[PDB]
């Protein structure tokens, strides 16, 4: 009893007769699944000596100092945009990493330098810095290797927001490695553990990756 459109009206009415939600369990085979689990990133060292860790009053204080410099960079960036600074007018930067390592070691993260870098540059510089901790055959210290720490800070302030997700990832690696570095500290002085504590504070506090809370 259909013509063209008529079968559609035969169907809307056919599905109306139907229970819409049907549930049917066991019957054949079933049983509890053995499964394939999940390949997971291992949680760091919990750590030894919770005394090396910082005071909340300090953490909150160090975050003020960060957010303040961040807001002051924004001020300087707006003043640059008003003076029609075209970021695209910036020539091509090296990808050498070694040419870079020497630059950061020897030149400082002054705003004059840092403001000339695009979000993509900062993005890449951070990946570089990350790899510069993630076992250089160098016995890295941050307290000693100040230029690293100084740059890591700068780079972190500058990063334009929202941050891309792989920037969060390549930041969590920095979190992890200074968690690591710091765990190697005795009591090897509170001040020697100080940089890592800041770069963790930030990660948990500023970049709100709380699945670290308990390492800061």
């Amino acid at each position: 009893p259909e013509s063209g459109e008529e079968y559609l009206m035969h169907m809307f009415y056919e599905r109306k007769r139907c229970p819409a939600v049907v549930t049917k369990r066991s019957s054949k085979i079933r049983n509890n699944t053995g499964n394939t689990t999940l390949e997971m990133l291992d949680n760091p060292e919990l750590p030894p000596f919770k005394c090396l860790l910082p005071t909340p009053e300090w953490r909150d204080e160090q975050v003020k100092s960060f957010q303040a410099a961040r807001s002051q960079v924004l001020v300087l960036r707006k003043e640059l945009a008003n003076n029609n600074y075209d970021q695209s007018g910036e020539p091509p930067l090296t990808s050498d990493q070694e040419k870079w390592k020497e630059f950061c070691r020897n030149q400082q993260p002054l705003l004059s330098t840092l403001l000339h870098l695009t979000q993509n540059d900062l993005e890449l510089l951070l990946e570089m810095l990350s790899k510069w901790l993630q076992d250089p055959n160098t016995t890295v210290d941050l307290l000693h290797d100040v230029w690293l720490a100084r740059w890591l800070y700068a780079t972190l302030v500058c990063l334009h927001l929202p941050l891309e997700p792989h920037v969060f990832s390549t930041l969590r690696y920095i979190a992890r490695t200074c968690i690591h570095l710091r765990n190697q500290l005795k009591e090897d002085e509170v001040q020697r553990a100080a940089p890592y504590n800041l770069l963790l504070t930030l990660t948990v506090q500023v970049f709100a990756q709380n699945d670290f809370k308990d390492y800061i």
Binding site: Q62, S65, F66, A68, A69, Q72, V73, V75, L76, E79, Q108, P109, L110, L111, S112, L114, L143, A149, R150, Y153, A154, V157, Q191, A194, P195, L198
Partner: peptide
């Protein structure tokens, strides 16, 4: 405000010592 090109080196240094 405006100047002090050091700033990022200064705020990091003071945030640690």
């Amino acid at each position: 405000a405006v100047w002090d090109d050091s700033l990022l080196v200064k705020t990091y240094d003071e945030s640690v010592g």
